[PDB]
């Protein structure tokens, strides 16, 4: 699937059903909702940054070269620009993990529909299933709800293949 769908503004991952009756864009509810739950929890958990406690820390040379100041200075300046870099990495990290998580959900749904349909359809296009037989609106729901049944439409589909075979 190398092309995005603008019409699927309800959820991320969706199916474009096409029957003799018509064509629509139906999002998969469980995939989108579960993914949204996981992504949101990642976001809120990443926020936890738990900076070091405010240990009321400051010193200075005290006119006697008490570099505790330049030590404590570096220590705070060195904790930042290190944690900041480290945090930039964690953002970039989580960014990719969300992106590949998305690609994985795509491929999982495509395998779901392949497993149900099997040889009752042709894999054609960028993730499109051309039904040899006619999947009714209900039948389209059954594939979506995971309740599709191969045998009922099997024989009809088989004869159609043999016609073009």
């Amino acid at each position, epitope marked *: 699937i190398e092309g995005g769908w603008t019409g699927m503004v309800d959820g991320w991952y969706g199916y474009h059903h096409q029957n003799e009756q018509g064509s629509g864009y139906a999002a998969d509810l469980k995939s989108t909702q579960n993914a949204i739950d996981g992504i949101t929890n990642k976001v*809120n958990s990443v926020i936890e940054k738990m900076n070091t406690q405010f240990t009321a820390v400051g010193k200075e040379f005290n006119h006697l070269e008490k570099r505790i100041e330049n030590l404590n200075k570096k220590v705070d300046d060195g904790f930042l620009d290190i944690w900041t870099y480290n945090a930039e990495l964690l953002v970039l990290l989580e960014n990719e993990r969300t992106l590949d998580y998305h690609d994985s959900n795509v491929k999982n749904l495509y395998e779901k529909v392949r497993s149900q349909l099997k040889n009752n359809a042709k894999e054609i296009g960028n993730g499109c299933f051309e039904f040899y037989h006619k999947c009714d609106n209900t039948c389209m729901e059954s594939v979506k709800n995971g309740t599709y049944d191969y045998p009922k439409y099997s024989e009809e589909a088989k004869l159609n293949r043999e016609e073009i075979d």
Partner: antibody, heavy 122, light 113 residues
Framework: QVQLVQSGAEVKKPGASVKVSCKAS????????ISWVRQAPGQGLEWMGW????????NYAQKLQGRVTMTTDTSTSTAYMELRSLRSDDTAVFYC???????????????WGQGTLVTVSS | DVVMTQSPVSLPVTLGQPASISCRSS???????????LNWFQQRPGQSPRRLIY???TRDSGVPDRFSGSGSGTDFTLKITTVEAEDVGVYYC?????????FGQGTKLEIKR
């Protein structure tokens, strides 16, 4: 503008189905969703469910999942909440509120309805 | 599941005494959209609930500047300056971004003392 008209007050006995209606207008009904809230007599506000007119995406609250059934008539822009099984504890007033339809988008109970109280005792 | 704890349930005030209502969540309340979601509500007794602050920092069209939603982390607050008389009533936190939507308990106001 703001017009969330709830149904009339309803009185039933335990174990009978109840049907509340919230008819909406005076404001664009562009698939905007509708959620239903319950306030026990002079007690807390408990969210019951949400339905997206854009889709059929119901989210009934775990506590009450089997009994509760929600519907939408886009043509009349009216939502419906139906509690199949009634209880004396369920006796309360019910409230409606608009919600955003897309799960991707957040939520907006911008408009609230007129409280339909429902009494349930034998 | 989400737990909205409302710290100051009982809140008597005197006219013109900015008072605050604290809502504390069990988990962070940010969402994929980007914005947090704690639209505060007010149900003036005898009337149906009303919305105040959209998200965490957005006053509603017909809301007095007195009402002000605040807070960034799990602990959010709502401070109303010049507490007036229609201001009295019950208030609830907003449902968490989690689909478990949680209004939490209520906070009641008094006119004077």
């Amino acid at each position: 503008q703001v017009q969330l008209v709830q149904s009339g007050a309803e009185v039933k006995k335990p174990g009978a189905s109840v049907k509340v209606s919230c008819k909406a207008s005076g404001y664009s009904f562009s698939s905007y969703g509708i959620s239903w809230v319950r306030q026990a007599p002079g007690q807390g506000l408990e969210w019951m469910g949400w339905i997206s007119a854009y889709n059929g995406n119901t989210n009934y609250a775990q506590k009450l999942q089997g009994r509760v059934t929600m519907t939408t008539d886009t043509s009349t822009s009216t939502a419906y909440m139906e509690l199949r099984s009634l209880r004396s504890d369920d006796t309360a007033v019910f409230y409606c509120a608009r919600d955003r339809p897309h799960i991707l988008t957040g939520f907006d109970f911008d408009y609230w309805g007129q409280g339909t109280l429902v009494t349930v005792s034998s | 599941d989400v737990v909205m704890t409302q710290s100051p349930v009982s809140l008597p005030v005197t006219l013109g005494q900015p008072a605050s209502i604290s809502c504390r969540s069990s988990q962070g309340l940010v969402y994929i959209d980007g914005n947090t979601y704690l639209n505060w509500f007010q149900q003036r007794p005898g009337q149906s609930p009303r919305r105040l602050i959209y998200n965490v920092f957005t006053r509603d069209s017909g809301v007095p500047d007195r009402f002000s939603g605040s807070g960034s982390g799990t602990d959010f607050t709502l401070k109303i300056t010049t507490v007036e008389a229609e201001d009295v009533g019950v208030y609830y936190c907003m449902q968490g971004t989690h689909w478990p939507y949680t209004f939490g308990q209520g906070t009641k106001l008094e006119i004077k003392r």
